[PDB]
């Protein structure tokens, strides 16, 4: 599968969910990128204008790709693997209620998973792994990447 062939990667937050404080969206997304830069040679920088590698979008229903959202529940988000244009982009379903905590759907935890896809990871069959296909809340303040996820990403980078 495709991988980024460079170490400096940019992201841009296209728009913000009204579910959360602006600064909390920024922080959740920043921390999610950090999870992966911790275990690879990758560096992530937020840009406010122009073409980023990874565009972060909040949208509902049909939103201009082959991955229409399905209302509250079900599919929470999706992302494209490394590549030009839409490649790398991560989309979050606005019909979910995004939060900083255990209520609603945790943005940070969801973003860690989707960014995994943005970097070229597939799914894991291990329920402990963040790349498990289905969402589950774990304490965000003590979150640690599982051994399986580390193995997965280190097969692609570093
Ligand atoms: Ca949904
Ligand atoms: Ca892109
Ligand atoms: Ca929402
Ligand atoms: Zn989409
Ligand atoms: Zn997934």
Curated annotation (Swiss-Prot):
Ca(2+) 1 binds at residues 19, 94, 96. The keyword ATP-binding does not apply. It comes from the Eukaryota. Zn(2+) 1 binds at residues 63, 65, 78, 91. One of its GO terms (molecular function) is serine-type endopeptidase activity. It is found in: Secreted, Extracellular space, Extracellular matrix. GO terms for biological process: bronchiole development; cellular response to virus; collagen catabolic process; elastin catabolic process; extracellular matrix disassembly; extracellular matrix organization; lung alveolus development; negative regulation of endothelial cell-matrix adhesion via fibronectin. Keywords: Calcium, Disulfide bond, Extracellular matrix, Glycoprotein, Hydrolase, Metal-binding, Metalloprotease, Protease, Repeat, Secreted, Signal, Zinc, Zymogen. Zn(2+) 2 binds at residues 113, 117, 123. The active site is at residue 114. Ca(2+) 3 binds at residues 70-71, 73, 75, 93, 96. Ca(2+) 2 binds at residues 53, 85, 87, 89. GO terms for cellular component: cytoplasm; extracellular matrix; extracellular region; extracellular space; nucleus. Found in alveolar macrophages but not in peripheral blood monocytes. Induction: By exposure to bacterial lipopolysaccharides (LPS). Inhibited by dexamethasone. May be involved in tissue injury and remodeling. Has significant elastolytic activity. Can accept large and small amino acids at the P1' site, but has a preference for leucine. Aromatic or hydrophobic residues are preferred at the P1 site, with small hydrophobic residues (preferably alanine) occupying P3. The conserved cysteine present in the cysteine-switch motif binds the catalytic zinc ion, thus inhibiting the enzyme. The dissociation of the cysteine from the zinc ion upon the activation-peptide release activates the enzyme. Belongs to the peptidase M10A family. This is Macrophage metalloelastase. It comes from Homo sapiens (Human). The chain holds residues 106 to 263 of 470 of the full protein.
């Amino acid at each position: 599968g495709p991988v980024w062939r460079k170490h400096y990667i940019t992201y841009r937050i296209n728009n913000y969910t009204p579910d959360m404080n602006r600064e909390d969206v920024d922080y959740a997304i920043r921390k999610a990128f950090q999870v992966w830069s911790n275990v690879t040679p990758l560096k992530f920088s937020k840009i406010n204008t122009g073409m980023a590698d990874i565009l972060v979008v909040f949208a509902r229903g049909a939103h201009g790709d082959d991955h229409a959202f399905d209302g509250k529940g079900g599919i929470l988000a999706h992302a494209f693997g490394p590549g030009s244009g839409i490649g790398g982009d991560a989309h979050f379903d606005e019909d979910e209620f995004w939060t900083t905590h255990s209520g609603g759907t945790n943005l940070f935890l969801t973003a860690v998973h989707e960014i995994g896809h943005s970097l070229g990871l597939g799914h894991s069959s291990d329920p402990k792994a963040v790349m498990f296909p289905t969402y589950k809340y774990v304490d965000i303040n003590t979150f640690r990447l599982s051994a399986d996820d580390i193995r997965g990403i280190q097969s692609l980078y570093g």
